Amino acid sequence: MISLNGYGRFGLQYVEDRGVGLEDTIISSRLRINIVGTTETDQGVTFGAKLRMQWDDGDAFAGTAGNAAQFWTSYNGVTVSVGNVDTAFDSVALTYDSWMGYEASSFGDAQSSFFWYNSKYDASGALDNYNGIAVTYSISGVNLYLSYVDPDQTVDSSLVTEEFGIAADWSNDMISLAAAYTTDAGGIVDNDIAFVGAAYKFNDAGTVGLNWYDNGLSTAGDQVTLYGNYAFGATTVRAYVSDIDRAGADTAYGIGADYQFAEGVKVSGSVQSGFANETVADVGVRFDF
Amino acid sequence: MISLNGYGRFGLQYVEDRGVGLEDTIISSRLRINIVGTTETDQGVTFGAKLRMQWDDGDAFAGTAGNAAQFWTSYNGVTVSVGNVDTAFDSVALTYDSWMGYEASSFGDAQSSFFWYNSKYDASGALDNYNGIAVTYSISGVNLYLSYVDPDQTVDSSLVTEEFGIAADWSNDMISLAAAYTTDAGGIVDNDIAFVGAAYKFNDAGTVGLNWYDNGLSTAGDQVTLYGNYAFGATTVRAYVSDIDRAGADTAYGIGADYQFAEGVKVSGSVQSGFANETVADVGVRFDF
Amino acid sequence: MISLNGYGRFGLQYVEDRGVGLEDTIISSRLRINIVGTTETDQGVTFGAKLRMQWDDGDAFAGTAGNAAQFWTSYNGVTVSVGNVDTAFDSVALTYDSWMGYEASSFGDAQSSFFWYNSKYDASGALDNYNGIAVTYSISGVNLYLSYVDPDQTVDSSLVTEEFGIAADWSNDMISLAAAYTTDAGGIVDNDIAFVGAAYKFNDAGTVGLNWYDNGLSTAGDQVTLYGNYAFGATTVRAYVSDIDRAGADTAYGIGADYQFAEGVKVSGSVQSGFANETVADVGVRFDF
Ligand SMILES: CCCCCCCCOCCOCCOCCOCCO
Numbered sequence: 001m002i003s004l005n006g007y008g009r010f011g012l013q014y015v016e017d018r019g020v021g022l023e024d025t026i027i028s029s030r031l032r033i034n035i036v037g038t039t040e041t042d043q044g045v046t047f048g049a050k051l052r053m054q055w056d057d058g059d060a061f062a063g064t065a066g067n068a069a070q071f072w073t074s075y076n077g078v079t080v081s082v083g084n085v086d087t088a089f090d091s092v093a094l095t096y097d098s099w100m101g102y103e104a105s106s107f108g109d110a111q112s113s114f115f116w117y118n119s120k121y122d123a124s125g126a127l128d129n130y131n132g133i134a135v136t137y138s139i140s141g142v143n144l145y146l147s148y149v150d151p152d153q154t155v156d157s158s159l160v161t162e163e164f165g166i167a168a169d170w171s172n173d174m175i176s177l178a179a180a181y182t183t184d185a186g187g188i189v190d191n192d193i194a195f196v197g198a199a200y201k202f203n204d205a206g207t208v209g210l211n212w213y214d215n216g217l218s219t220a221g222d223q224v225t226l227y228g229n230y231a232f233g234a235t236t237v238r239a240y241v242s243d244i245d246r247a248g249a250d251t252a253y254g255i256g257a258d259y260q261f262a263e264g265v266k267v268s269g270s271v272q273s274g275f276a277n278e279t280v281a282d283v284g285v286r287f288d289f
Numbered sequence: 290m291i292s293l294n295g296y297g298r299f300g301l302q303y304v305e306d307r308g309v310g311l312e313d314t315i316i317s318s319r320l321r322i323n324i325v326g327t328t329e330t331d332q333g334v335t336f337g338a339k340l341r342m343q344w345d346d347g348d349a350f351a352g353t354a355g356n357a358a359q360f361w362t363s364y365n366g367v368t369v370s371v372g373n374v375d376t377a378f379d380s381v382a383l384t385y386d387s388w389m390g391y392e393a394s395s396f397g398d399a400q401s402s403f404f405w406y407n408s409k410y411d412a413s414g415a416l417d418n419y420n421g422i423a424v425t426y427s428i429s430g431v432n433l434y435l436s437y438v439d440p441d442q443t444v445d446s447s448l449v450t451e452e453f454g455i456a457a458d459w460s461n462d463m464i465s466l467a468a469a470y471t472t473d474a475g476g477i478v479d480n481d482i483a484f485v486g487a488a489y490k491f492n493d494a495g496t497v498g499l500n501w502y503d504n505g506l507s508t509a510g511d512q513v514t515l516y517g518n519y520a521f522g523a524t525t526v527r528a529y530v531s532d533i534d535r536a537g538a539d540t541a542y543g544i545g546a547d548y549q550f551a552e553g554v555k556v557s558g559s560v561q562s563g564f565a566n567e568t569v570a571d572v573g574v575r576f577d578f
Numbered sequence: 579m580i581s582l583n584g585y586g587r588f589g590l591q592y593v594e595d596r597g598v599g600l601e602d603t604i605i606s607s608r609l610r611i612n613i614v615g616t617t618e619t620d621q622g623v624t625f626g627a628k629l630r631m632q633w634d635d636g637d638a639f640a641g642t643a644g645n646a647a648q649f650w651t652s653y654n655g656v657t658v659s660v661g662n663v664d665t666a667f668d669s670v671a672l673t674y675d676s677w678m679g680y681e682a683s684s685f686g687d688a689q690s691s692f693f694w695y696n697s698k699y700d701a702s703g704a705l706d707n708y709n710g711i712a713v714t715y716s717i718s719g720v721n722l723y724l725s726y727v728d729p730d731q732t733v734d735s736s737l738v739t740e741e742f743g744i745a746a747d748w749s750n751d752m753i754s755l756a757a758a759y760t761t762d763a764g765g766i767v768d769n770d771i772a773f774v775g776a777a778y779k780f781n782d783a784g785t786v787g788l789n790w791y792d793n794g795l796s797t798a799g800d801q802v803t804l805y806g807n808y809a810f811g812a813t814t815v816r817a818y819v820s821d822i823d824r825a826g827a828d829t830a831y832g833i834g835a836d837y838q839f840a841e842g843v844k845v846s847g848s849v850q851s852g853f854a855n856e857t858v859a860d861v862g863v864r865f866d867f
Pocket residue numbers: 010011012027267283284285371422437
């Protein structure tokens with residue numbers, strides 16, 4: 001069986017003083033198409049394969065291509081994936097919950113380098129022999145994630161640096177806890193990163209959370225992000241503040257709102273301020289199909 | 290929801306004396322696949338996104354890629370589109386009705402340069418930050434079209450030339466009228482083009498029309514195309530004659546036929562003569578799927 | 579109508595002493611997606627078009643693109659195809675029946691150069707004006723195949739070498755016979771190749787066959803491959819031995835097994851030895867969707 005799903009998004013993206021001779025405000029848009037092939041068996045084992053075709057405004061050649069394939073095998077809550085995998089640091093819950101605006105971005109996200117699912121081709125040739133293995137296991141409320149990425153699997157393993165990651169999250173109706181740790185993140189020797197987060201659903205309407213990160217060799221040093229969101233009917237209000245250890249850094253912060261226009265249609269906007277005083281703002285729509 | 294549609298076409302394409310060491314007759318073919326994502330809402334607003342994958346014989350690398358995305362929002366007869374848009378000069382009725390043969394071509398088409406929907410990627414890098422906005426409005430019989438194309442939206446607007454186009458068509462059962470005007474067509478300063486056309490359905494079987502163009506900075510100068518077509522059951526006969534103001538130009542003319550083999554299957558052929566005495570002929574099939 | 583089908587495969591691929599500084603064992607995988615457009619008519623003539631998107635581990639840019647299109651017209655057992663066609667030497671029965679392992683490979687396959695369906699783009703530019711015509715005709719048990727490939731159809735025909743191929747196979751319940759002949763195979767002047775094969779189904783469980791080849795200008799010279807396979811319920815055991823005329827060559831041989839885990843899911847493995855003493859082994863899964 002083959003299924004297709006995806007989303008389109010478009011709107012305005014403002015970056016205060018983007019560059020000499022550059023427009024501060026542009027129309028930023030993205031089209032994402034996922035192609036999923038699945039083979040269900042009567043033994044209860046599912047085999048799947050996925051390809052992504054994603055286009056972003058500004059992409060080279062004004063064209064769209066597919067990325068590198070991902071394969072998986074699923075059985076009784078256990079999923080083993082091979083190829084262009086989702087990694088543990090990128091898959092755990094809570095780590096991206098300060099996201100806001102129609103481009104779902106946040107200075108409050110971890111400021112470190114690590115591997116993640118590659119949505120597109122890479123013209124440098126760097127990902128040509130990149131291969132990962134990932135294992136996920138889900139119990140009721142517990143999620144365990146394991147990932148191993150070899151950036152160049154054809155070369156002897158002792159000559160290249162592999163990324164190894166582990167992560168777990170747990171949640172009940174009101175409290176959520178999550179943690180992750182990855183050694184040699186991004187294939188960088190000694191870039192060891194970690195995350196610990198917690199969130200409290202202090203109503204059926206609000207949430208407040210706190211994420212803490214060790215960003216390894218990144219110049220940001222350790223980081224803390226405090227975020228919260230509140231739903232008023234169809235409109236959701238979001239905010240966050242984040243601090244890094246880098247000497248002289250500013251406190252980053254953002255404020256935004258989402259409006260659920262219809263099932264699958266979300267109008268979003270945000271005003272954010274970065275660690276180096278960058279001012280960014282956006283307003284747009286995302287529609288899922 | 291995601292839908293796929295398209296067409297295939299193949300046949301013979303003859304160009305008298307194509308070139309030294311070249312075959313005059315070749316097998317010319319095209320595969321076109323459109324990927325359309327749509328999100329319908331109960332408020333009556335539809336969101337859509339589209340991608341095209343088109344291959345033509347002779348294409349570089351013997352491969353097919355997707356183009357740059359188009360997004361739209363529709364409500365009550367009004368459609369706003371963003372990204373790789375259809376422009377007003379290319380969308381108006383009548384302007385392409387002298388087309389003939391299985392490759393749907395005609396020397397009688399406007400001899401000017403202007404932007405249009407980009408079916409493919411562009412290896413030059415020229416379309417990388419190209420972005421358009423288009424608005425269409427349809428009443429019963431009236432169609433209004435507006436388009437604005439910025440060839441490089443990241444650069445300050447006063448440093449680049451934007452194309453602005455406007456067009457409208459109207460029709461009842463027998464008479465059709467259409468007009469268009471575009472300033473700085475194709476991003477060329479002072480390339481201002483215009484079109485005015487009219488067609489008369491002098492039966493339920495025949496049509497005769499006349500298109501007039503101002504081709505802006507093109508060397509062709511003003512142009513007039515007179516065309517007609519007549520249906521005899523499943524077979525349609527077509528002809529046209531066209532004249533440009535260029536000094537020394539020949540009258541262009543063409544004669545062709547279509548045969549509707551089945552719903553979605555059209556066999557077509559044409560013999561055409563250009564403004565510089567070029568002789569072209571074709572015969573092939575188009576099938577829609 | 580547009581349909582999508584394909585397969586995914588992944589597993590281990592071992593090549594004894596692959597290279598200095600290289601890993602002998604790698605994770606080898608392939609994703610194949612076929613896009614088929616078809617137009618059925620009430621006259622009984624079907625028109626079709628096909629595109630393929632295939633990714634293999636190690637592919638340049640860690641991306642996937644479509645190949646060059648194939649078009650066909652079918653009526654009463656006769657199929658005419660144009661464009662990126664399947665050729666007669668590659669389409670006949672029996673010639674690939676010594677295949678084994680999850681990568682379906684065999685040293686026992688013909689050691690010659692010839693054109694075949696191109697699954698992917700070609701960055702060299704070599705296939706840009708490549709065009710084929712192929713005609714197949716199937717009676718009850720008889721299959722006839724004809725193919726003509728022009729590697730650069732834009733250039734005068736007397737300046738380029740075209741491949742012409744013919745093939746036929748016949749089978750009843752127990753005996754199968756097949757033969758093929760191709761002149762200027764692969765666009766190489768005087769590379770004339772041939773094949774003759776026969777297979778005997780000596781049960782409802784086993785098969786033994788013998789393929790013979792004339793490999794034209796290849797250094798392998800003539801070749802003989804003897805293969806057999808036996809089904810034990812869901813598990814199939816396969817073997818082959820092959821000899822070439824090249825001076826000093828070793829006898830190639832392979833042994834493998836398939837396990838039909840479920841409809842559309844096949845687990846396969848093989849250990850093979852080549853004509854130059856190469857030792858290859860594989861183990862993996864293929865799943866069809
Ligand atoms: C009006 C044509 C010339 C001006 C071009 C500058 C472009 C600014 O126009 C904004 C028109 O809006 C379209 C873009 O998508 C973002 C809109 O907001 C999203 C939905 O809430």
